[PDB]
């Protein structure tokens, strides 16, 4: 009477190695399956499925995943450990703080080990700290850390990476519009692969994101811990535009046998502050539809007040992001300003030394672009934090898996059981 | 989010079951202060327990109230008793033995 | 083991500045929030403000803000990790002792807390 069944449609929640597949990069896109030009969603009638995008395993493995591209990108290239030394910096030649950029001479090692070369570098003022002889500096990595010039060809672009699952193995996209991100979800797909997610790492705003089709959407793991950011979705984008006005042509020295450092020259212009723009009277109203969706959460009758960042690094007192091959830490100040009852000029600030993941001891040098850097980014989405009649919106971030929550929190990994054992009236 | 908890002054004896209302709608948790050596983690969550502690202390829950319902009363218990969920902590009552 | 060694007790006037370190040691630093409390002279906790091991990332109550400021500082490695608590505008009613606790889940549950520390204005 037990009947046996091969390719019955049943699943079990589950964990597996997904691989990439996508259409001089630092993740290595190159390495990738080509994608299914026309990806192929069968749309499930009738199933519910029980969601959870703060408990997902592909995000922690998505976090794992840019993390080794990013150590194996950095791995065959230039090591900067003779480029810690102490450096007699003057001011760049200028009028004015703007104490921005630091002309800094140093010996530096030639190709020859018994001979050295006095060059120069225009070093960004958060790249140097100054030691002791008031004009003497040093690399701010030297008592922390081991810096590794990133390949200038190696580019820092977020390039779209679909993860497929492994055959026997399935993704459940879920479909419904309005998804506080837990929780069973109605009108669930099969896909073989998610969709381009770029890896856009950034703190305080989610950028070149994927957007909500039907409200701002607010999702937290609890709206009652503050611990818990809150990721904001937009329904519709807001675009921001930097510019790095600075012409910084660059200059190689051989630092040496076969070993170059790049290093910024003069400047080909006017000394002047990077900046990023966003337009006034679309971020008012993008603030708008958000307070309305707090407030849904938070009473009718609250306040919802938006500050700027409390405190911590630099990498989450200001958007940080990376733009052009630059890395922009934009103040951000003037966007979270309101208490909610013509361009919004964002001063930024570059870095060239970057400790990416929050870990010591493998910081990079990013080499200097030449020429104009310019961001077009689209913010469809920030990342705040609640303070502990009125409730305060800090910015917040640092922890890139939530930068990723925000784009695989549809999708969910099954594991496709087909054995089934049924009764029927047939016998062997 | 919003809690109570009565009373304030408990007076007990030795081998008692004593019990210390609290209704909160948070995840609770129940701390002993000793009066100047900071508090201590008993019960965590509504009725886990924490390593170190006895099973003297135990916590149940009843739609909203918690009761660290502390049997076999002994006189290492003569300190302060305090609920917290979150970041909001009531003062807590101070047992009398 | 996991310790949470504080300052000694420091005496200050109204106006001036307190520091209150928490010298950290004997765990993973970096996966679990510190949260700086406040007992007044016979009175309940007062929560002061979490500090995020990992950003530095402060958050504190409306009555805090301006006013306290809770820093760290990693040696090599993140091994110690010392959390400072800093107050500005300091009054005679902020005469507390100020313990540190780590947050070590969701539930906030606070397993292990410091020594304490006496501020007296």
């Known amino acids: 009477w037990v009947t046996v069944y091969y390719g019955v449609p049943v699943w079990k929640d589950a964990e597996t190695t997904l691989f990439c597949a996508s259409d001089h990069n630092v993740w290595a896109t190159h390495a990738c399956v080509p994608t299914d030009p026309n990806p192929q969603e069968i749309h499930l009638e009738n199933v519910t499925e029980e969601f959870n995008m703060w408990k997902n395993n592909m995000v922690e493995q998505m976090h794992t995943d840019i993390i080794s591209l990013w150590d194996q990108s950095l791995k065959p290239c230039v090591k900067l450990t003779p480029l810690c030394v102490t450096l007699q910096c003057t001011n760049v030649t200028n009028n004015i703080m703007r104490g921005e950029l630091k002309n800094c001479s140093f010996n530096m090692t030639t190709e020859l080990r018994d001979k050295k070369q006095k060059v120069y570098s225009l070093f960004y003022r958060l790249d140097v700290v100054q030691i002791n002889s008031n004009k003497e500096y040093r690399l701010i990595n030297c008592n922390t850390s081991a810096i590794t010039q990133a390949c200038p060809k190696v580019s820092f672009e977020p390039i779209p990476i679909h993860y497929c699952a492994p055959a026997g193995f399935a993704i459940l996209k879920c479909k419904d519009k309005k998804f506080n991100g837990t929780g069973p979800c109605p009108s669930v797909s099969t896909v073989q692969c998610t969709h381009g997610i770029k890896p856009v790492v950034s703190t305080q705003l989610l950028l070149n994101g994927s957007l909500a089709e039907e409200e701002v959407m607010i999702r937290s793991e609890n709206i009652t811990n503050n611990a818990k950011n809150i990721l904001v979705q937009f329904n519709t984008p807001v675009q921001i535009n930097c510019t790095r006005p600075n012409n910084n042509t660059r200059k190689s020295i051989r630092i040496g046998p076969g070993q170059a450092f790049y290093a910024t020259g003069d400047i080909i212009g006017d000394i002047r502050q990077a900046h990023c723009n966003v337009s006034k009277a679309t971020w008012n109203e993008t603030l708008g539809k958000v307070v309305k969706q707090l407030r849904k959460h938070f009473g009718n009758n609250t306040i919802i007040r938006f500050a700027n960042s409390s405190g911590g690094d630099l990498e989450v007192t200001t958007h940080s992001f990376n733009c052009g091959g630059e890395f922009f830490y934009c103040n951000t100040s003037g966007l979270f300003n309101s208490t909610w009852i013509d361009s919004i000029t964002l001063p930024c600030r570059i870095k060239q030394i970057i400790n990416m993941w929050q870990r010591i001891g493998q910081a990079m040098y990013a080499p200097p672009i030449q020429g104009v850097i310019r961001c077009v980014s689209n913010i469809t989405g920030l990342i705040l934090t609640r303070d502990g009649t009125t409730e305060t919106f800090r910015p917040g971030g640092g922890d890139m898996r939530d930068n990723w929550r925000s784009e695989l929190y549809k999708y969910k990994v099954v594991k496709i059981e087909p054995l089934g054992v049924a009764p029927t009236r047939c016998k062997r | 989010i919003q809690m109570t908890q009565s009373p304030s002054s408990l007076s007990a004896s030795v081998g008692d079951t004593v019990t210390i209302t609290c209704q909160a709608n948070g995840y609770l948790n129940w701390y002993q202060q000793r009066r100047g050596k900071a508090p201590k983690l008993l019960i965590y969550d509504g009725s886990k327990l924490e390593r170190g502690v006895p099973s003297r202390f135990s916590g149940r829950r009843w739609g909203q109230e918690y009761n660290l319902t502390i049997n076999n009363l002994q006189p290492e218990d003569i300190a302060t008793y305090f609920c917290q969920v979150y970041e909001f902590v009531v003062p807590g009552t101070r047992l009398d033995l | 083991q996991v310790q949470l060694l504080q300052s000694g007790a420091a005496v200050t006037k109204p106006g001036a500045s307190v520091r209150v370190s928490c010298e950290a040691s004997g765990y993973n630093i970096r996966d679990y929030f510190i949260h700086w409390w406040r007992q007044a002279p016979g009175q309940g906790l007062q929560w002061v403000g979490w500090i995020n091991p990992k950003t530095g990332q402060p958050n504190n109550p409306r009555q805090f803000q301006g006013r306290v400021s809770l820093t760290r500082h990693a040696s090599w490695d993140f091994d110690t990790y010392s959390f400072y608590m800093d107050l500005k505008a300091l009054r005679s009613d902020d005469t507390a002792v100020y313990f540190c606790?780590?947050?070590?889940?969701?539930?906030?549950?606070?397993?292990?807390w410091g020594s304490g520390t006496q501020v007296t204005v």
């Open positions: 606790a780590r947050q070590r889940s969701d539930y906030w549950d606070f397993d292990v």
